[PDB]
Coordinates of C-alpha atoms in Angstrom, one line a residue:
Chain A
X3 CA 53.0 89.2 65.6
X4 CA 56.6 88.9 64.3
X5 CA 56.2 91.4 61.4
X6 CA 53.2 93.0 59.6
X7 CA 52.1 95.7 57.2
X8 CA 53.8 99.1 56.9
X9 CA 51.5 101.5 55.1
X10 CA 48.0 99.9 54.8
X11 CA 48.2 98.6 51.2
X12 CA 48.5 94.8 50.5
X13 CA 51.1 95.5 47.8
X14 CA 53.8 98.1 47.2
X15 CA 51.9 100.1 44.6
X16 CA 53.5 100.9 41.2
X17 CA 56.9 102.8 41.3
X18 CA 57.8 102.8 45.0
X19 CA 61.4 102.1 45.9
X20 CA 61.6 99.0 48.1
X21 CA 64.2 96.6 49.4
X22 CA 64.6 92.9 48.8
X23 CA 67.1 90.1 49.4
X24 CA 67.9 87.5 46.8
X25 CA 67.2 83.9 48.0
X26 CA 68.0 81.6 45.2
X27 CA 68.3 81.7 41.4
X28 CA 67.8 78.6 39.2
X29 CA 66.6 79.8 35.7
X30 CA 64.0 82.6 36.2
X31 CA 66.0 85.0 38.3
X32 CA 65.8 85.6 42.1
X33 CA 63.0 84.5 44.4
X34 CA 63.2 87.7 46.4
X35 CA 60.9 88.7 49.3
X36 CA 59.8 92.3 49.9
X37 CA 61.6 93.3 53.1
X38 CA 59.0 95.9 54.1
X39 CA 56.2 93.2 54.0
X40 CA 58.7 90.4 54.9
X41 CA 56.5 87.3 54.5
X42 CA 55.3 88.4 51.1
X43 CA 57.5 87.7 48.1
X44 CA 58.0 88.9 44.5
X45 CA 60.6 88.0 41.9
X46 CA 63.0 89.5 39.4
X47 CA 64.0 88.4 35.9
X48 CA 67.6 87.8 34.8
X49 CA 67.7 90.8 32.4
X50 CA 66.6 93.0 35.3
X51 CA 69.7 92.0 37.3
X52 CA 73.1 93.3 36.3
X53 CA 73.3 93.7 32.5
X54 CA 76.4 91.6 32.1
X55 CA 75.3 88.0 32.0
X56 CA 76.0 87.0 35.6
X57 CA 78.0 83.8 35.9
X58 CA 76.9 81.1 38.3
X59 CA 80.1 81.6 40.3
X60 CA 79.1 85.3 40.3
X61 CA 75.5 84.3 41.1
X62 CA 76.2 82.4 44.3
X63 CA 77.9 85.2 46.3
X64 CA 74.8 87.5 46.3
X65 CA 72.2 85.1 47.8
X66 CA 70.8 85.9 51.3
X67 CA 72.2 89.4 51.3
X68 CA 69.9 92.4 50.6
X69 CA 69.8 95.4 48.3
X70 CA 67.4 98.1 47.1
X71 CA 64.9 98.0 44.2
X72 CA 61.8 99.4 42.7
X73 CA 58.7 97.5 41.5
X74 CA 57.8 97.3 37.8
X75 CA 54.3 95.8 37.9
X76 CA 51.9 94.7 40.6
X77 CA 49.3 91.9 40.5
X78 CA 46.3 93.2 42.4
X79 CA 45.6 89.8 44.0
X80 CA 48.6 87.6 43.3
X81 CA 51.8 88.2 45.2
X82 CA 53.8 87.6 42.0
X83 CA 55.1 91.2 41.4
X84 CA 57.9 92.3 39.1
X85 CA 61.0 93.9 40.6
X86 CA 63.5 96.4 39.2
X87 CA 67.0 97.0 40.7
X88 CA 68.8 97.6 37.4
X89 CA 66.9 100.9 36.7
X90 CA 67.6 102.4 40.2
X91 CA 69.8 105.4 40.8
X92 CA 72.5 105.3 43.5
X93 CA 70.7 108.0 45.5
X94 CA 68.0 105.4 46.4
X95 CA 70.6 103.6 48.4
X96 CA 70.8 106.8 50.5
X97 CA 67.1 107.5 50.2
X98 CA 65.4 104.1 50.7
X99 CA 67.8 102.1 52.8
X100 CA 68.3 104.7 55.5
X101 CA 64.6 105.2 55.5
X102 CA 64.3 101.4 55.8
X103 CA 67.0 101.5 58.5
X104 CA 64.9 104.2 60.2
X105 CA 62.1 101.5 59.9
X106 CA 64.4 98.7 61.1
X107 CA 65.0 100.5 64.4
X108 CA 61.2 100.7 65.0
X109 CA 61.2 96.9 64.5
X110 CA 63.6 96.7 67.4
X111 CA 61.3 98.6 69.7
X112 CA 58.0 97.1 68.6
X113 CA 59.1 93.5 69.2
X114 CA 59.6 93.5 73.0
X115 CA 56.6 95.9 73.3
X116 CA 54.5 93.3 71.5
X117 CA 55.7 89.7 72.3
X118 CA 57.4 90.3 75.7
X119 CA 54.1 92.1 76.5
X120 CA 52.4 89.1 74.8
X121 CA 50.2 91.0 72.3
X122 CA 50.4 90.7 68.5
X123 CA 52.6 93.2 66.8
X124 CA 50.2 94.7 64.3
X125 CA 47.6 96.1 66.7
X126 CA 50.0 98.3 68.6
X127 CA 51.6 99.1 65.2
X128 CA 48.3 100.2 63.6
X129 CA 47.6 102.4 66.5
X130 CA 50.7 104.3 65.5
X131 CA 50.8 104.3 61.7
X132 CA 48.0 106.7 60.4
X133 CA 48.6 109.7 62.9
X134 CA 52.4 109.3 62.5
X135 CA 53.5 107.8 59.2
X136 CA 50.6 109.3 57.2
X137 CA 50.3 112.7 58.9
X138 CA 54.0 113.1 58.1
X139 CA 57.1 111.0 57.8
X140 CA 57.3 107.7 59.7
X141 CA 57.6 107.8 63.4
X142 CA 61.3 107.1 64.4
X143 CA 62.4 110.7 63.9
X144 CA 59.1 111.5 65.7
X145 CA 60.1 109.0 68.4
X146 CA 63.1 111.4 69.0
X147 CA 60.4 114.1 68.9
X148 CA 57.9 112.4 71.2
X149 CA 60.4 112.2 74.0
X150 CA 60.1 116.0 74.0
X151 CA 57.0 116.7 71.9
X152 CA 54.3 115.0 74.0
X153 CA 51.3 116.0 71.8
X154 CA 51.9 112.6 70.0
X155 CA 51.5 110.4 73.0
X156 CA 48.2 112.1 73.7
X157 CA 47.5 112.4 70.0
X158 CA 46.6 108.7 70.0
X159 CA 45.1 106.6 72.8
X160 CA 47.5 104.1 74.5
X161 CA 45.9 100.7 74.4
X162 CA 48.7 99.7 76.8
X163 CA 51.0 101.8 78.9
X164 CA 54.0 99.5 79.2
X165 CA 54.9 100.6 75.6
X166 CA 55.0 104.2 76.7
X167 CA 57.6 103.3 79.4
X168 CA 59.6 100.8 77.3
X169 CA 60.3 103.4 74.5
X170 CA 62.2 106.0 76.6
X171 CA 64.2 103.3 78.4
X172 CA 65.9 102.1 75.2
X173 CA 66.4 105.2 73.0
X174 CA 66.6 107.7 75.9
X182 CA 81.1 103.8 77.2
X183 CA 83.8 103.9 80.0
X184 CA 87.5 104.2 79.1
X185 CA 89.3 103.2 82.3
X186 CA 92.3 105.2 83.6
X187 CA 94.4 104.3 86.6
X188 CA 96.4 107.6 86.9
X189 CA 99.1 107.4 89.6
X190 CA 99.6 110.6 91.5
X191 CA 103.0 109.6 93.0
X192 CA 103.5 113.2 94.5
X193 CA 106.1 114.2 97.1
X194 CA 105.0 117.8 97.7
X195 CA 103.2 120.5 99.7
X196 CA 100.9 122.2 97.2
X197 CA 99.8 118.9 95.7
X198 CA 96.3 118.9 97.2
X199 CA 95.5 122.2 95.4
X200 CA 96.8 120.8 92.1
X201 CA 94.6 117.7 92.5
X202 CA 91.6 119.8 93.2
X203 CA 92.3 121.9 90.1
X204 CA 92.6 118.8 88.0
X205 CA 89.3 117.5 89.4
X206 CA 87.6 120.9 88.6
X207 CA 88.2 120.4 84.8
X208 CA 88.4 116.6 84.0
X209 CA 85.2 115.8 85.9
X210 CA 83.1 118.7 84.4
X218 CA 83.9 112.1 83.0
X219 CA 83.5 109.6 85.9
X220 CA 86.4 110.2 88.4
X221 CA 86.9 108.1 91.5
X222 CA 89.4 108.4 94.4
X223 CA 91.0 105.1 95.4
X224 CA 93.7 106.5 97.8
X225 CA 96.1 109.4 97.8
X226 CA 98.1 108.1 94.8
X227 CA 95.7 105.9 92.8
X228 CA 92.7 107.3 91.0
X229 CA 90.2 105.4 88.8
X230 CA 88.7 107.5 86.1
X231 CA 86.4 106.0 83.5
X232 CA 86.1 108.5 80.7
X233 CA 82.8 108.3 78.7
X234 CA 83.1 107.9 74.9
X235 CA 80.3 108.6 72.4
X236 CA 81.7 107.0 69.2
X237 CA 84.1 105.0 71.5
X238 CA 86.7 106.9 69.5
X239 CA 85.6 110.4 70.8
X240 CA 87.0 109.5 74.2
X241 CA 90.4 109.2 72.5
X242 CA 90.4 113.1 72.4
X243 CA 89.2 113.1 76.1
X244 CA 91.5 110.8 77.9
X245 CA 94.5 112.3 76.1
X246 CA 93.4 115.8 77.0
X247 CA 93.0 114.7 80.7
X248 CA 96.5 113.2 80.6
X249 CA 97.9 116.5 79.1
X250 CA 96.1 118.5 81.9
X251 CA 97.6 116.2 84.5
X252 CA 101.1 116.7 83.0
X253 CA 100.6 120.5 83.0
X254 CA 99.3 120.6 86.5
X255 CA 102.1 119.1 88.6
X256 CA 105.0 121.1 87.2
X257 CA 103.5 124.3 88.6
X258 CA 102.9 123.1 92.2
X259 CA 105.8 120.8 93.2
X260 CA 104.9 117.1 93.1
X261 CA 104.9 114.2 90.7
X262 CA 102.1 112.6 88.6
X263 CA 102.6 109.5 86.4
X264 CA 99.9 108.2 84.0
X265 CA 99.2 104.6 83.0
Chain B
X98 CA 96.3 115.8 126.3
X99 CA 98.5 112.7 126.7
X100 CA 100.8 113.5 129.6
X101 CA 103.5 110.8 129.5
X102 CA 104.7 108.4 126.7
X103 CA 104.5 105.0 128.4
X104 CA 105.8 102.0 126.4
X105 CA 104.8 98.4 126.4
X106 CA 107.5 95.6 126.2
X107 CA 107.5 91.8 126.1
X108 CA 108.0 88.5 124.2
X109 CA 106.2 87.8 120.8
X110 CA 102.8 86.0 121.3
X111 CA 102.6 86.9 125.0
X112 CA 99.9 89.6 124.9
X113 CA 101.0 93.2 124.8
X114 CA 98.0 94.1 122.7
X115 CA 95.9 92.1 125.1
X116 CA 97.3 94.0 128.1
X117 CA 96.6 97.3 126.3
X118 CA 93.0 96.2 125.6
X119 CA 92.6 95.3 129.3
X120 CA 93.9 98.7 130.4
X121 CA 92.1 101.0 127.9
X122 CA 89.6 99.1 125.6
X123 CA 91.4 100.8 122.6
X124 CA 92.6 98.1 120.2
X125 CA 96.0 98.0 118.5
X126 CA 94.0 96.5 115.6
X127 CA 96.5 93.8 114.4
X128 CA 96.3 94.3 110.7
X129 CA 97.5 93.9 107.0
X130 CA 96.1 90.2 107.1
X131 CA 99.6 88.9 108.0
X132 CA 99.3 90.7 111.3
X133 CA 95.6 90.0 111.8
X134 CA 96.5 86.3 112.6
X135 CA 100.1 87.0 113.7
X136 CA 102.1 90.2 114.7
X137 CA 102.0 94.0 113.9
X138 CA 104.6 96.1 112.1
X139 CA 103.4 99.6 113.2
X140 CA 103.2 100.8 116.8
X141 CA 99.9 100.0 118.6
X142 CA 98.1 103.0 120.1
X143 CA 95.8 103.4 123.1
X144 CA 94.6 106.2 125.5
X145 CA 94.2 105.3 129.2
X146 CA 92.5 107.4 131.9
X147 CA 93.7 108.2 135.4
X148 CA 91.1 109.7 137.6
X149 CA 91.8 108.5 141.2
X150 CA 89.3 107.5 143.9
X151 CA 90.6 109.3 147.0
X152 CA 87.5 109.7 149.2
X169 CA 90.2 104.9 137.7
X170 CA 89.2 103.6 134.2
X171 CA 86.0 105.8 134.0
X172 CA 85.4 109.4 135.5
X173 CA 82.6 108.2 137.9
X174 CA 82.9 106.8 141.5
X175 CA 79.6 104.7 141.4
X176 CA 81.7 101.5 141.4
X177 CA 84.2 101.9 144.4
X178 CA 81.6 102.5 147.1
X179 CA 81.9 106.2 147.9
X180 CA 79.8 108.5 145.5
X181 CA 82.5 111.2 145.6
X182 CA 83.4 111.3 141.9
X183 CA 86.7 110.2 140.3
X184 CA 89.3 112.9 140.9
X185 CA 91.3 113.8 137.8
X186 CA 95.0 112.8 137.9
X187 CA 96.2 112.2 134.3
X188 CA 95.6 111.0 130.8
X189 CA 98.3 108.6 129.5
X190 CA 99.1 107.2 126.0
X191 CA 100.6 103.9 125.0
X192 CA 103.7 103.2 123.0
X193 CA 103.3 99.5 122.1
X194 CA 106.1 98.2 119.8
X195 CA 106.7 94.7 118.1
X196 CA 108.4 92.2 120.4
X197 CA 109.9 90.2 117.6
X198 CA 113.7 89.8 117.1
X199 CA 113.3 90.4 113.3
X200 CA 111.4 93.7 113.7
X201 CA 113.5 95.5 116.3
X202 CA 114.0 98.7 114.5
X203 CA 110.5 99.9 115.3
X204 CA 111.1 99.0 119.0
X205 CA 114.3 101.0 119.0
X206 CA 112.5 103.9 117.5
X207 CA 109.8 103.7 120.2
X208 CA 112.4 103.6 122.9
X209 CA 113.8 107.1 122.2
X210 CA 110.3 108.5 122.1
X211 CA 109.1 106.9 125.4
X212 CA 109.4 108.5 128.9
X213 CA 108.7 105.2 130.8
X214 CA 108.3 101.4 130.3
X215 CA 106.0 98.5 131.1
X216 CA 107.4 94.9 131.2
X217 CA 105.4 91.8 130.3
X218 CA 106.5 88.3 131.4
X219 CA 104.3 85.2 131.0
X220 CA 103.9 82.6 133.8
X221 CA 104.3 79.3 132.0
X222 CA 106.9 80.6 129.6
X223 CA 110.5 80.9 130.9
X224 CA 112.2 83.6 133.0
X225 CA 115.4 84.1 130.8
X226 CA 113.4 84.7 127.6
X227 CA 115.8 86.2 125.0
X228 CA 113.6 88.9 123.4
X229 CA 112.4 90.2 126.8
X230 CA 116.0 90.4 128.0
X231 CA 117.0 92.3 124.8
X232 CA 114.1 94.7 125.3
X233 CA 115.2 95.3 128.9
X234 CA 118.8 95.9 127.8
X235 CA 117.6 98.4 125.2
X236 CA 115.5 100.2 127.9
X237 CA 118.5 100.4 130.2
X238 CA 120.6 101.8 127.4
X239 CA 118.1 104.5 126.4
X240 CA 117.3 105.9 129.9
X241 CA 114.0 104.0 130.6
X242 CA 114.6 102.3 134.0
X243 CA 111.0 103.4 135.1
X244 CA 109.6 99.9 134.3
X245 CA 106.4 98.5 135.8
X246 CA 106.8 94.7 135.6
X247 CA 103.7 92.6 134.8
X248 CA 103.2 88.9 135.3
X249 CA 100.8 88.2 132.4
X250 CA 99.9 84.5 131.8
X251 CA 99.3 83.8 135.5
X252 CA 95.8 82.5 134.7
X253 CA 97.6 79.2 133.9
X254 CA 100.1 78.7 136.7
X255 CA 100.2 76.9 140.1
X256 CA 100.3 78.4 143.6
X257 CA 104.0 77.5 143.9
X258 CA 105.2 77.6 140.3
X259 CA 104.2 81.3 139.9
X260 CA 106.0 82.1 143.2
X261 CA 109.1 80.3 141.9
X262 CA 109.0 82.2 138.6
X263 CA 108.7 85.5 140.6
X264 CA 111.7 84.6 142.7
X265 CA 113.7 83.7 139.6
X266 CA 112.8 87.1 138.1
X267 CA 113.9 88.9 141.3
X268 CA 117.2 87.0 141.2
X269 CA 117.7 88.0 137.6
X270 CA 116.9 91.7 138.4
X271 CA 119.9 92.3 140.8
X272 CA 122.8 93.3 138.5
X273 CA 120.6 95.2 136.0
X274 CA 120.1 99.0 136.2
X275 CA 116.6 98.1 137.3
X276 CA 116.9 97.5 141.1
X277 CA 113.5 97.6 142.8
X278 CA 111.1 98.0 139.9
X279 CA 107.5 96.9 141.0
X280 CA 106.0 93.5 139.9
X281 CA 102.2 93.0 139.5
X282 CA 100.3 89.7 138.7
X283 CA 97.6 90.6 136.1
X284 CA 95.2 88.8 133.8
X285 CA 94.9 90.7 130.5
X286 CA 91.9 88.5 129.4
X287 CA 90.0 88.0 132.7
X288 CA 90.4 91.7 133.8
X289 CA 91.8 91.4 137.3
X290 CA 94.6 93.1 139.5
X291 CA 95.1 96.2 137.2
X292 CA 94.2 98.5 140.1
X293 CA 97.7 98.1 141.4
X294 CA 99.2 98.9 138.0
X295 CA 97.1 102.0 137.8
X296 CA 98.3 103.1 141.2
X297 CA 101.9 102.5 140.2
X298 CA 101.4 104.6 137.1
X299 CA 101.0 107.6 139.5
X300 CA 103.3 106.1 142.3
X301 CA 106.5 104.7 140.6
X302 CA 106.4 106.7 137.4
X303 CA 106.5 110.5 138.0
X304 CA 106.4 112.5 134.7
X305 CA 109.8 114.0 133.9
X306 CA 109.4 117.8 133.4
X307 CA 108.9 119.2 129.8
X308 CA 108.8 122.9 129.4
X309 CA 108.1 125.8 126.9
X310 CA 111.5 127.2 126.0
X311 CA 113.5 124.0 125.2
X312 CA 113.8 124.1 121.4
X313 CA 110.7 122.4 119.7
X314 CA 111.6 119.0 118.1
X315 CA 109.2 116.5 116.7
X316 CA 110.2 112.8 116.1
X317 CA 108.1 111.0 113.5
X318 CA 107.3 107.3 113.7
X319 CA 104.2 107.0 111.4
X320 CA 102.9 108.4 108.1
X321 CA 99.1 108.7 107.5
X322 CA 96.8 109.6 104.7
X323 CA 93.1 109.9 105.7
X324 CA 92.2 109.7 102.0
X325 CA 89.2 107.3 102.1
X326 CA 88.4 105.1 99.1
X327 CA 85.2 106.4 97.5
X328 CA 85.4 110.2 98.0
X329 CA 85.6 113.1 95.4
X330 CA 88.7 115.3 95.0
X331 CA 86.6 118.5 95.5
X332 CA 86.5 117.2 99.1
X333 CA 90.3 116.5 99.9
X334 CA 92.5 115.9 102.9
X335 CA 96.2 116.6 103.5
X336 CA 99.0 114.6 105.1
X337 CA 99.0 113.5 108.7
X338 CA 102.3 112.7 110.5
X339 CA 102.1 110.4 113.6
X340 CA 105.0 111.6 115.7
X341 CA 106.0 112.4 119.3
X342 CA 107.3 115.7 120.9
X343 CA 109.9 115.6 123.7
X344 CA 110.5 119.4 123.7
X345 CA 108.5 122.5 122.6
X346 CA 104.7 123.0 122.7
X347 CA 103.7 123.1 119.0
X348 CA 100.6 125.4 118.6
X349 CA 98.2 125.6 115.7
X350 CA 99.4 127.7 112.7
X351 CA 103.1 127.1 112.4
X352 CA 105.5 126.2 109.5
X353 CA 107.7 123.1 109.6
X354 CA 110.8 121.6 108.1
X355 CA 111.2 117.8 108.0
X356 CA 115.0 117.4 107.7
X357 CA 116.2 113.9 106.7
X358 CA 114.9 115.1 103.3
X359 CA 113.7 113.8 100.0
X360 CA 115.9 111.8 97.7
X361 CA 117.1 113.0 94.2
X368 CA 122.6 110.9 95.2
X369 CA 121.5 113.8 97.5
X370 CA 118.6 114.5 99.8
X371 CA 116.5 117.7 100.2
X372 CA 114.4 118.6 103.4
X373 CA 110.5 118.8 103.1
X374 CA 108.5 122.0 104.1
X375 CA 105.0 121.8 105.6
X376 CA 102.6 124.3 107.2
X377 CA 100.4 123.0 110.0
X378 CA 96.8 122.0 109.0
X379 CA 96.2 120.4 112.5
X380 CA 97.9 119.3 115.7
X381 CA 95.7 116.4 116.8
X382 CA 95.9 114.5 120.1
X383 CA 93.6 112.3 122.3
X384 CA 90.4 111.8 120.1
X385 CA 89.7 115.5 119.6
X386 CA 91.9 118.1 117.7
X387 CA 93.4 120.8 120.0
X388 CA 95.0 124.3 119.8
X389 CA 98.3 123.0 121.3
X390 CA 100.6 119.9 121.6
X391 CA 102.3 119.9 125.0
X392 CA 105.4 117.6 124.9
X393 CA 105.7 114.1 126.4
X394 CA 103.0 112.7 124.1
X395 CA 102.5 111.0 120.7
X396 CA 100.6 113.3 118.3
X397 CA 98.9 113.2 114.9
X398 CA 100.1 116.3 113.1
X399 CA 98.0 117.4 110.0
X400 CA 100.3 119.3 107.6
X401 CA 99.8 120.9 104.2
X402 CA 102.2 118.2 102.8
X403 CA 100.8 115.6 100.3
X404 CA 99.0 112.5 101.6
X405 CA 100.9 110.7 98.8
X406 CA 104.1 111.1 100.9
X407 CA 102.0 109.9 103.9
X408 CA 101.1 106.8 101.9
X409 CA 102.0 103.8 104.2
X410 CA 105.3 104.0 106.1
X411 CA 107.3 106.8 104.5
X412 CA 107.4 109.3 107.5
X413 CA 109.1 106.7 109.7
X414 CA 112.2 107.9 111.6
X415 CA 112.1 111.5 110.4
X416 CA 112.8 114.7 112.3
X417 CA 110.5 117.7 112.3
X418 CA 111.5 121.2 113.3
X419 CA 109.6 124.6 113.5
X420 CA 110.7 126.8 110.6
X421 CA 113.8 128.9 111.2
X422 CA 115.8 126.0 112.7
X423 CA 119.1 124.1 111.9
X424 CA 119.3 120.4 112.5
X425 CA 122.2 118.8 110.5
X426 CA 121.9 115.9 108.1
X427 CA 125.0 113.8 108.7
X428 CA 126.3 110.8 106.7
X429 CA 129.9 110.8 108.0
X430 CA 129.5 110.4 111.8
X431 CA 131.8 110.6 114.9
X432 CA 130.5 107.9 117.3
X433 CA 131.4 107.3 120.9
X434 CA 130.6 103.5 121.2
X435 CA 130.3 101.0 124.1
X436 CA 129.6 97.3 123.8
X437 CA 128.7 94.0 125.6
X438 CA 130.8 91.0 126.6
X439 CA 128.0 88.7 125.4
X440 CA 125.2 89.4 122.9
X441 CA 121.4 89.4 123.1
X442 CA 118.5 88.3 120.9
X443 CA 119.5 84.6 121.1
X444 CA 118.7 81.8 123.7
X449 CA 123.0 80.7 122.9
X450 CA 124.2 84.1 124.2
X451 CA 127.2 84.4 121.8
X452 CA 130.5 86.1 122.5
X453 CA 130.9 89.8 121.3
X454 CA 133.6 89.5 118.7
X455 CA 135.2 92.9 117.9
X456 CA 133.5 95.2 115.3
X457 CA 134.8 94.6 111.8
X458 CA 135.6 97.4 109.3
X459 CA 133.4 98.2 106.3
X460 CA 130.5 96.0 107.6
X461 CA 126.8 96.8 107.5
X462 CA 125.6 97.6 111.0
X463 CA 122.2 99.1 111.9
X464 CA 122.5 102.4 113.9
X465 CA 119.3 103.4 115.7
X466 CA 119.4 107.1 116.5
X467 CA 116.2 108.4 118.2
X468 CA 113.9 107.0 115.5
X469 CA 116.2 106.3 112.5
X470 CA 117.3 102.7 111.7
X471 CA 120.1 103.5 109.2
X472 CA 122.4 100.9 107.6
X473 CA 125.9 102.0 108.4
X474 CA 129.4 101.0 107.2
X475 CA 132.4 101.3 109.6
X476 CA 135.2 103.6 108.5
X477 CA 137.5 103.2 111.6
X478 CA 137.7 101.3 115.0
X479 CA 139.7 103.0 117.8
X480 CA 139.5 102.5 121.6
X481 CA 136.0 103.8 122.5
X482 CA 135.3 105.8 119.3
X483 CA 134.2 104.8 115.8
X484 CA 133.7 106.7 112.5
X485 CA 130.7 105.7 110.5
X486 CA 129.5 106.0 106.9
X487 CA 125.7 106.3 106.4
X488 CA 124.0 104.9 103.2
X489 CA 120.9 106.9 104.4
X490 CA 121.4 110.4 106.0
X491 CA 120.2 111.0 109.6
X492 CA 119.7 114.3 111.4
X493 CA 121.6 115.4 114.6
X494 CA 120.4 118.5 116.5
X495 CA 121.8 117.6 119.9
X496 CA 124.2 114.8 120.9
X497 CA 121.6 112.1 120.0
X498 CA 121.0 108.7 121.7
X499 CA 122.0 105.6 119.8
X500 CA 121.3 101.9 120.1
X501 CA 123.5 99.8 117.8
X502 CA 122.8 96.5 115.9
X503 CA 124.6 93.9 113.8
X504 CA 124.1 91.0 111.4
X505 CA 125.7 87.8 112.6
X506 CA 122.8 85.3 112.6
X507 CA 120.8 86.5 109.5
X508 CA 118.4 88.9 111.4
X509 CA 119.7 91.9 113.4
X510 CA 121.1 91.3 116.9
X511 CA 121.7 94.0 119.5
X512 CA 125.5 94.5 120.1
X513 CA 125.8 97.8 122.0
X514 CA 125.2 101.5 122.2
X515 CA 126.7 104.9 121.1
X516 CA 126.5 108.7 121.2
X517 CA 127.2 111.1 118.3
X518 CA 130.2 113.2 119.5
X519 CA 128.9 116.5 118.0

């Protein structure tokens, strides 16, 4: 209801790269939990941590926070499975964690589609998993496909149809500028029109003859740094060739 | 269009706006939140109809008995200025734009009211003796008191350049007795002739942008100048120079081609003089922002008005001043002192270079434009705000 299975096995079968967080260490090692099957928990031994004997002041800084690991051995019925993060390449940080981050963002969408719709999370999860995460890779890149490749929405039955609407609402910023056209001319209107015809094609609003409120959309918030500046430059260019005066805030 | 520029004059908080409303229905607005409660800065505008019943306010004779319809006489436009002794510049500007006047005196408020007297004096100075006098707050006064007031007014108007100017007892709120006023508008005020060939000159009192908050720039509007013509029919599709200029210290005249020449409520081909007109020009609405085109001269392109700062004035003054209750003695003009020289529409702050016998030489801190001889009303700072001292002509 809060979290559940990923890939229809009770345990992360031998040699699959997983992620855990370290909770506490007393003498055995860490009492980690498997972040793909969150409520289940395994553990790691002290020699399978960092090779240098880790001091207790070095030990305390790493609890709570998470990392990447692989599993050494698996009990078929006990949850007491053996971890391995020492014998893990650095590429699995790129491989597993972004794959897990691609599975963290489907946790963000399947929570309000479950509990704010008041159904348990696993039943509308396990309608998704086998035709998506077993037919091919798991469904978040397919969720950027299923907004345009609609053989997936009909490839499985919808047990509810609120979830079909709540997906495209989520997955599918304004920089304010108060530019002051303080003109005293005769060909200024034309200039203004010209300016409009390049800076808007982002959100440009007339306030009066001098004041204009333009809220330039940014994608990385820092990509509108190259937009606003450009607009300003254009404005500067514009008014020297017509006769008036534009001043920018 | 608007045939004759008729001005409205009276005391502050008497009801010039009210009178206008009573006449036309067109509201002067009363604005900027200060003026919503109190008193306007800009001129108030209204368009009144004259279609006489000869067998009126509306062009139908269903009301006054005879079904023979209201016979077209004229269409008249109002020039309603601020009647405050602080804001007199606007009034002065209005004065040398008007062709005729309309006085407003309240019943319960006194007969020698200072502001009203000042206004009257100004009118006298600037050739505006065609004054229709209106008793306004008479819906308050006794059967004897009103009469007494009238008598006093009559007594007052004996030595003035107004001799037998007509008096009407109206209610601006109750809507009565304005028939007489209407009649007088044709009777006592004939329109002074205004031809084709007398060199075209436009006198600007107002600046207007019609740039509405919310629009897109792909749908833009130019600059509209609210100004009056007293010579030369401006037709659609002409080039203009506005000559008091734009400031750099030196000034340089502004050039604008006509977008529109708008009068009444509907844009027209022409603008026949003796009327106050909204002239759409290719000029920026950023220069028509609030009150920038106030007291500027507009000429048709290929014309020479002159932008003077050093001026030859022929001046004439009072014995005793106006604006005050307390009518103070006119002490002689003092050299290198800031006067306010109102010339047609300008309200320039001037310093005195010399004082002679009837002539004075003036320095202007802001340049004004003289085409003709130009009519002047003069003003001075003795009691903080600007009092009216006398009058002048530019000897050029």
